[model samples]
Target chain A: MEDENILRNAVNLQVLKFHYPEIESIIDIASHVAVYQFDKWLKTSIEGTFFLVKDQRARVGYVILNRNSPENLYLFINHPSNVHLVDRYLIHRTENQHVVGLWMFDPNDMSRIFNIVKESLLR
Target chain B: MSFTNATFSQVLDDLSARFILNLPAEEQSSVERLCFQIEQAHWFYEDFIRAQNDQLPSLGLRVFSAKLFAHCPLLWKWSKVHEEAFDDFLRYKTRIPVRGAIMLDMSMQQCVLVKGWKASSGWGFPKGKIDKDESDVDCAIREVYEETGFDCSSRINPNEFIDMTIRGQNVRLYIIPGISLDTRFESRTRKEISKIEWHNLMDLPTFKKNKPQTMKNKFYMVIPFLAPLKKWIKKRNIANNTTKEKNISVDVDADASSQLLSLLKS
Candidate 1:
């Protein structure tokens, strides 16, 4: 199951981009390493989280995804038990891109991000 | 005014105000962490220099100082701090670290390992640091040519390599099968890597075991990659008996890294 904390703090990329554009930029570069480390921390040692990011945009939110249909992705929390088709992607937003990268959350969203991450841990 | 002339509290205040005040609200914490670490170390070295009649620091201390100096926007902003102190640290106490790429030529069934002769001796792969606006993979490819004279440009795959922090720096390591090694190789580190050899992966354990005790730890770091490396080699269809060794050559000149070296010294 997807951790409740990740869900709580999990801001949507679409929401973040249209609403918090500057925040998205910060996450792309400045907070990049922090999010990368966070992604590493979320996975099993041998395997890891596959965070999706874009060139300069679409970099703020840490996305957790799972394929449910031809077009839908389980964006927030989902059952981790499903092991099929989970492969690491790469740069250029291609397939099999391993997601946990350096794009950490924006500082403006620090408290909210922390609050959500913190809540996930408690549960 | 010299850093020593400024009171500790005053320096702290100045750094806090000058270093982080203008950064965006979202960047404070990370910037704060880098500042605090550098400041904490600064206090120690500052006190030591004054007490020891301005004696030079040990290599360990210098490395620690250099690492922080390489980081920290405050260090570069030393234009406001004392020039003499900043120059002394830059000239005498700093050694900008050099990274290498640990590449495996899967097509040839051999891994390219470079031997460094300066201050220590060991054989390792090719990699390097993040240059101006360079990505991890880009830096790794550039370092391969700079250090080993090997062109890994066409050999790299976006999704194939492993990216990890080895010794506190992000290492972009790759293995490509169908790449050719340059006949002439020269390391930009002023002959840091004195030799380059394409060795078999299966012989890694024996090669590492034969190293001096001091260099053993570096080899241990390579041990864990054996399994993954083997898998990659198998995936590439490399033959175990393929001993097609290429005639390797090298060219090392002091001027190669003079520009980069000058910046650090300056």
Candidate 2:
């Protein structure tokens, strides 16, 4: 239902793009961390990235995958809600990519996208 | 004068005017550099009309300033104005005869699905919120996809954020900075929008008559936006036909933005 409204209202979802190597923190999330720490993180812990996609352009969304060390991510928004679609699409990265560890945004979507990690496709 | 070197008010005055005027190239680089700096340094600005009765453009002033906020998480704690401003933006956004587009094969100098998410509107433009640490251009591109579920290479026109604010949401009339080809309008997050299709300026009249009654009232006010919107679209098409990339300039640097950093300390 939430997904439906996001589509209904044409809400712009983010896609955090990255390449083979980590880009040494573009400072995008630096402030988010500082603020969260400053705010005491009692409320929320947020990190993100920027990519080219908006609400109405259709079939597009954002990616901000958080792979925070060991075990499943707590926040990975892209996790698939529809059980039927076993393989979740990569909203970020130029193609089907893998993220490691616990994410916050969406768990199911994470399981689907990072299934490779689950399958041990690591370098 | 350079934005960093300008006086505080001069800088702000420049930002306001330039953002409203919509210069495309010169400020584009600066906007990105400054936004990056704002992110690295954790800066943000505070802006609002103070009164709803002020000029409508002033209403959009909130969005203009809000951009400064969303791009820099360092300044998040500076003020409560963001909450109020966002609330205002939502109120107005809800009322907006919002339009969206998918610029597939934009290189063909053509945009598709210039329609609305709702039955009442077609010929809509895709847009979205400027998230924390996000750049203006990214917002434009992300917004289009988030709303309509399509992909395109996008460019942010400098000062393209013109026009009066509606219901307090920052509003602007912009053009696709460059061209995109072979675009697809598919869904990533289906909740953001339900449907998208091609609707052009020529087809809006018959479409408007069938709008929901509640939306009908909103349409009267929407006319002002469409008037400029149509003209803006016309301008977009014209700019594309010409090949010489002119060196246009504007002053949207981070002059007053520095004060925001210090203001947080104070």
Candidate 3:
């Protein structure tokens, strides 16, 4: 019953693209269907009231979108398949593809988000 | 113009204006002491040279020591010491290993983070430099308690840790999972930590790509741990699921036996 809320709030690909056009270029949207499935599974399990976790996994890379506010976004991108690229990025050997993912929230929620990410994603 | 007592007073005033203003009483005292010692060293260097004292070497070492402890009050105690001893202290200090707790909610979605006093300071875990003679876990407990006001002694799993070397500092964050999101956290240190917050790990930038997406570029210390932390979590989840499956099978077996006994009684 609790799982229904996450699935219910799932934003369709068309709506998502319409809202964040640059998301396609930032993350490969060719596998939007599979990415949507991953998103549903992640959101359903990760519990939060005001924030949503959107997962996108493509042949190229994997991205996690954290939408805490309507006007802003947070993206965690990792290319597990391309370990070299990940290492290069970590050491500042290369720059990431430009995309919009900055957003704001209450200072109090900053600590809350830290714990939430740990429990939901890490645990 | 010669370096006079008036010059010294001006130097003190300038130091107060630059580094001591708005600091807490204790920190102000520390910075003041370091500044005084630095100026004293410079004054002596000037005095000895004027007197043509060949025994007194160059002021370069003193200047080096002054710069080393300029911004770091914690190292003020070693300011006037021998250069070899000071160098040894510095070498030991750098390797003293930081310890802290990664407090997480039961759901493992959020973790506690602390912000320093500066508006430009980035968010970091509730941890601090390990003090002399303190064990790793003891240091973690003390630092966590001091920074977040939460007692994590019982929760800290000594074996479960995320260790990383960030810019020559060895930081080990012990995982203290199952903390509630509603946990009240405040820094015990006066004016050191501006805010204690529960930030979503997902919201934290793990890599440079996510760096610009964050506010004020504050996650430099946090980015290095994210990848390893996620890997650890995934491993723990797999282990947890196996135990959960076993528990479920046991529950099913007990239910079936209970039903059989009820049927036999009927």
Candidate 4:
């Protein structure tokens, strides 16, 4: 995962992790951490699948599920731990890197984070 | 002079050819239904006037008529032969000296949008006009750069007009898929556009409710563009589903845990 802070929105534009259902008690739900992440993502209106970029069997990083949907707005997790993963997996960045995507964990802060995502989409 | 029997016949043949090639298979039924009303092309003018005079022509008829006027060169020439016909059919075209593109991030989840301070439409995707001979793809890239300073080296393939025309303006739009380019934008002060950012496509209406007063009224105008974009995005992701290994999991706090339990139960 990107650094929890970045995933938690270290910048104005950040990425948040997302999820969907699995047959076996919700894949990640075999563990408690998955439940917590799923709950946090659900609190926000963001839906759909989240993908991790893997090399061989090892997970190299992640990609945006919604980003693959053509043209729509979505969030991603970007903690410092994950920022480097973002940088590594990031195929393209703005000439200035001002365009941002992050992960915001605080439910209270979701609206603000949503506002930021909203603002970027409108801009 | 009105279209002659020869010119009309010629144009009819062209439309049939074009329709077969350009119109999608799904739209064939719609176009064929409208085509039933006229076997020859001259009848188009008669029905067009009837449509303009509010005789209740079907939308398919209007769309078919507009497509010919806007796209068929031979018919355009015939319309031009009769000055009034050209003026009548094509006059609705907007002279707004503008065009735009909707750019998406690598993840395709978020799209870059701009709020034009000086534009008639306050908040919109990046786009602009170009030289009469310039390709819309090229124009959109240049316009996006000028408005947002994002030099998108993206390209649109298998180009097609979006077909969402404003009622009277007759304005048309085109789409540029995200995969075709290197999408990037840098935040910087730029003239014309006052704000720039990514928006969540899922809950777009929320932004409209919170839009600045100036932007609030213009929401309807943006919908034609927004709705099509959403459709396009959805179309792209049709075969896109999550892998089996992926799970819907998140780290939650005590408060959220209870909610999650409730959600799962219900």
In candidate 1, position B196 carries an lDDT of 73
What DockQ, on C-alphas, does every prediction get?
A: 0.01, 0.01, 0.01, 0.01
Clashes of 1: 20
Docking outcome class, model 3:
incorrect
Please give each candidate's TM-score: 0.32, 0.30, 0.39, 0.33
RMSD of each: 21.5, 20.8, 29.6, 27.9
- Candidate 4 local lDDT, B75-116, one digit each (tens): 322333453332233323343445566666656666666775
After superposition, candidate 3 runs with Cα above 4 Å error: A1-123, B1-94, B207-212, B243-266
TM-score: model 1 vs. ground truth: 0.32
Instruction: Using TM-score, rank the candidates from best to worst.
Output: 3, 4, 1, 2
| Greater-lDDT candidate between 1 and 2 | 1
For candidate 4, give the docking quality class from DockQ: incorrect
Error of 3 at B12 (Å): 44
Candidate number of the best TM-score: 3
For every candidate, the chain B TM-score is 0.44, 0.39, 0.54, 0.44
TM-score for candidate 3 (chain B): 0.54
Error of 2 at B120 (Å): 8.3
